[PDB]
Amino acid sequence: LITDPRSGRTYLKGRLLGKGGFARCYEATDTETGSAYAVKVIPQSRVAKPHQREKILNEIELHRDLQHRHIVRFSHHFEDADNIYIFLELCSRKSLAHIWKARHTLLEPEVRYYLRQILSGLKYLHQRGILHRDLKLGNFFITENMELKVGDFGLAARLEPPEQRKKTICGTPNYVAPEVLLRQGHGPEADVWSLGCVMYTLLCGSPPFETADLKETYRCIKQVHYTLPASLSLPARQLLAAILRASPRDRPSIDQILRHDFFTKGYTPDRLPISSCVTVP
Numbered sequence: 558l559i560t561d562p563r564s565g566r567t568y569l570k571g572r573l574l575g576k577g578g579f580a581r582c583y584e585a586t587d588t589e590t591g592s593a594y595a596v597k598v599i600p601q602s603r604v605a606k607p608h609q610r611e612k613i614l615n616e617i618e619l620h621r622d623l624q625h626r627h628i629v630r631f632s633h634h635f636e637d638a639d640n641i642y643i644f645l646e647l648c649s650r651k652s653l654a655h656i657w658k659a660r661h662t663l664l665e666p667e668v669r670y671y672l673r674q675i676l677s678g679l680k681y682l683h684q685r686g687i688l689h690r691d692l693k694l695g696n697f698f699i700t701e702n703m704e705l706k707v708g709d710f711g712l713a714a715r716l717e718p719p720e721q722r723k724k725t726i727c728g729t730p731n732y733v734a735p736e737v738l739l740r741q742g743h744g745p746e747a748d749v750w751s752l753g754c755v756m757y758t759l760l761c762g763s764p765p766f767e768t769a770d771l772k773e774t775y776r777c778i779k780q781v782h783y784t785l786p787a788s789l790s791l792p793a794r795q796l797l798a799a800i801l802r803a804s805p806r807d808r809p810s811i812d813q814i815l816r817h818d819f820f821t822k823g824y825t826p827d828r829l830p831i832s833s834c835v836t837v838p
């Protein structure tokens with residue numbers, strides 16, 4: 558159907574892109590200009606409580622001015638008594654979670670190709686004093702040009718000193734850093750850890766601390782108990798080992814990650830073919 562603001566400007570809702578607690582996403586085209594967006598439709602009732610209202614407002618607040626080629630462009634939002642409509646950059650090639658579901662694994666140059674873009678995106682965020690806090694495949698949006706845009710600022714936060722930062726446990730369990738599980742909160746090092754998990758998932762097929770239970774995963778994270786498949790290259794295993802460190806201060810910075818042999822000695826394609834979304838390039 559149609560969506561509209563205070564100006565009466567209409568937008569045609571296309572296909573449902575996805576759901577997940579608690580927003581429905583659609584492709585939305587402006588009726589008068591044809592401008593396409595990825596619209597997050599949030600029911601007002603699901604964000605009526607203060608904590609849920611604050612989460613939604615923070616996402617909008619932090620996402621608003623973010624201008625980087627490796628960051629989803631926030632377009633605009635508006636709201637009525639029923640919904641909150643968040644208009645975001647539509648990325649025609651879905652997400653790395655969609656590609657991962659189709660592929661299971663990516664080849665080393667592909668992982669390197671996406672990791673560079675993710676790191677470029679994250680660096681921009683970190684330089685702006687914003688922590689993503691929810692780095693996962695599901696949050697890396699792919700355009701028609703096979704350009705990765707880091708998205709979903711639903712858990713984004715202002716980077717705060719250790720003593721000041723909220724000590725809340727949040728973020729996708731398979732990607733969450735041990736200091737977060739230890740109620741020390743998220744620092745830039747927690748985003749770096751999530752990237753180590755991203756890298757591992759893309760190379761091996763599954764998150765490194767994935768188990769049957771959440772409790773067991775949390776124990777595996779805290780003890781940094783995971784297996785490095787023998788088939789991954791030495792620079793890939795070296796980088797995964799440097800990144801997946803229990804102590805946040807022992808982890809490399811984004812600049813250090815990018816100066817590691819995995820990136821410096823490895824082949825990075827200038828572009829990946831569209832076909833790589835569903836099958837080996």
Ligand SMILES: CC[C@@H]1[C@@H]2NN=CN2c2cnc(Nc3ccc(C(=O)NC4CC4)cc3OC)nc2N1C1CCCC1
Pocket residue numbers: 573574575576582583584595596597629645646647648649650651652698708709
């Ligand atoms: C709009 C919400 C987020 C997002 N946040 N920031 C940018 N975002 C997105 C940008 N582009 C897209 N693209 C798409 C995602 C899934 C599909 C897809 O076909 N989904 C099939 C299961 C029905 C198609 C997309 O574009 C044609 N999704 C976004 N997503 C997806 C998250 C899950 C649903 C949409």
